[PDB]
Amino acid sequence: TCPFYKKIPGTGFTVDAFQYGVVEGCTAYFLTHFHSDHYAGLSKHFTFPVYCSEITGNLLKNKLHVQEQYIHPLPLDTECIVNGVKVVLLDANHCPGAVMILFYLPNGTVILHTGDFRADPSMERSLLADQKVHMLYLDTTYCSPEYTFPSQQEVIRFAINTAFEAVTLNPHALVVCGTYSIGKEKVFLAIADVLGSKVGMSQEKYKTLQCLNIPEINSLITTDMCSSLVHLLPMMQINFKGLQSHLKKCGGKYNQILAFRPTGWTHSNKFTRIADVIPQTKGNISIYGIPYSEHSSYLEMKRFVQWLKPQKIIPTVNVGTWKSRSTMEKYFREWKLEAGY
């Protein structure tokens, strides 16, 4: 059954709750972003109102075939009325089209639902600055102090420098980047830009990218593999067997592959810096795991929450075990005692 952490009290709303069938008493289903664990259950046969960003709405229509009459896109940073309740959508700094949602309850309570987010100080100057938030439904993916990671900017600088050096030393080297969802587009776009190439990909992934309102996108991507020296493949194909295979397919146009695997966190984050990363190398193939995250680090999370000073926190991630739940509740209390709310 639908868990309590997906229901917004005092409303007939649910958030990211599409795999339970009809939810008794739901008059509007919000969708924070187009990642499969969040939209799981949506299809062309859905007949209830879905509220979301413009970009998520483009993906629901073109990739899922949800019918236009059930998709209600809203602009960001704008007070809107939905079924009699004032809401605002804010940029979540996650993947394209990902939002946080502010609900203004008839009783005066204000609730923020982060969806999936990477907290940033710029959020402290959004419409969140303007009033008190009583309850926070929080993306707690990396809620433990071991989780450190570098800025997105640092990671992109590393990738750009690594690729440019390799291809300038060997003009017959191929760059490959893995993907399995939207998100992390900066990795493959930044590498292609330094190499004076478009990025080449499959027809299904090009279609996906043409939904995302990225400026000048026609100048940046293509379905013609042969013309391009940065290719995208399914993350499942980013390994030696999969890459050797792929290298054959270009027909001796390339003699070396340099591949990136954008992970979230991995335990080499605890012992190594970005300046000191190394790849796995079998022959003329090298695979780099780069810690490009679209979720808050523990310190970014903690800063956000200490700034917001909510009355109550409801975790939406790692909630399945008593041990995780208890650990999270301990950090929340530390934070509140340190900051004095």
State yes or no: residue 185 binds Ni ion (CB under 5 A): no
Map residues 224-243 to x or -, x wherever contact with Ni ion holds by CB under 5 A: --------------------
Site string for Ni ion, 42-81 (x = CB under 5 A): ----------------------------------------
d(CA 238, CA 120): 31
Compare residues 46 and 294 and give the one whose CB is closer to Ni ion: 294
List the structure tokens of 270. 């605890």
State in angstroms the smallest separation of the CB of 184 from Ni ion.
Answer: 11
What is the CB neighbour count within 10 angstroms for residue 273? 9
Q: Which of 167, 179, 295 is nearest to 234 (CA)?
A: 179
Shortest spacing between CB 35 and Ni ion, in angstroms = 4
Residues contacting Ni ion: total by CB under 5 A: 2
Pick the stretch among 31-39, 68-76, 275-283, 320-328 that binds Ni ion (CB under 5 A).
31-39
Structure tokens at 25: 């008493």
Q: Which is closer to Ni ion, CB of 31 or CB of 159?
A: 31
Q: What is the chain's Cα-based Rg?
A: 22
Q: How far is the CB of 33 from Ni ion (least distance, A)?
A: 6
Amino acid at 52: C
- Using CB under 5 A, which residues numbered 282 to 341 contact Ni ion? none
Parallel, antiparallel, or unpaired for β 285-291 and 256-263? parallel
Point out which span in 34-42, 50-58, 133-141, 184-192 binds Ni ion (CB under 5 A): 34-42
Taking CB under 5 A as the rule, which mask of x and - marks residues 160-179 in contact with Ni ion? --------------------
DSSP 160-223: HHHHHHHHHH-TTEEEEEEESSS--HHHHHHHHHHTT-PEE--HHHHHHHHTS--TTHHHHEES
Tell me the angle at which helices 322-339 and 298-308 cross, rounded to the nearest 10 degrees: 50
**In the complex, minimum distance from the CB of residue 15 to Ni ion, in angstroms, rounded to a whole number:** 13
Place of tokens 């450190």: 148
Give me the least distance between CB of 221 and Ni ion, in Å please.
Answer: 22
Secondary structure in 3-state letters for 28-46: EEECCCCCHHHHCCCCCCC
Contact flag: residue 184 with Ni ion (CB under 5 A):
no
139 binding Ni ion? (CB under 5 A): no
Is the Cβ of residue 35 or residue 231 nearer to Ni ion in the bound state?
A: 35
Taking the complex as a whole, how short is the minimal distance between the CB of residue 68 and Ni ion, in angstroms? 25
* Strand ranges (E), 92-141: 99-104, 110-113, 135-138
Query: Three-state SS for 183?
Result: coil
Q: Which helix (H) or strand (E) holds 58?
A: helix 54-62
Closest to Ni ion by CB, 35 or 198: 35
> 133 is written with which tokens?
């938030």
| Least Cβ distance, residue 116 to Ni ion (angstroms) | 4
Tokens describing residue 69: 């009459």
Distances (CA, A) of 186 to 150, 152, 161, 217: 15, 9, 14, 12
- Which residues, other chains included, contact 214 with Cβ-Cβ below 8 Å and sequence gap of 6+? 96, 185, 220
Asked if residue 35 binds Ni ion (CB under 5 A), the reply is yes
Q: Which lies closer to Ni ion via its Cβ, residue 40 or residue 80?
A: 40
Q: Please, which residue, 116 or 300, has the CB nearer to Ni ion? A: 116
Between 139 and 230, whose beta carbon lies closer to Ni ion? Answer: 139
Please say which residue, 35 or 205, places its beta carbon nearer to Ni ion. 35
Q: How far is the CB of 94 from Ni ion (least distance, A)?
A: 6
DSSP classification of residue 273: -
Strands 85-91 and 71-73: unpaired
Which amino acid is it at 126?
S
Q: Is 116 in the site for Ni ion (CB under 5 A)?
A: yes
Is the Cβ of residue 116 or residue 185 nearer to Ni ion in the bound state?
116
**Least distance to Ni ion from the beta carbon of 4, Å?**
21
> Where do contacts with Ni ion occur on this chain (CB under 5 A)?
35, 116
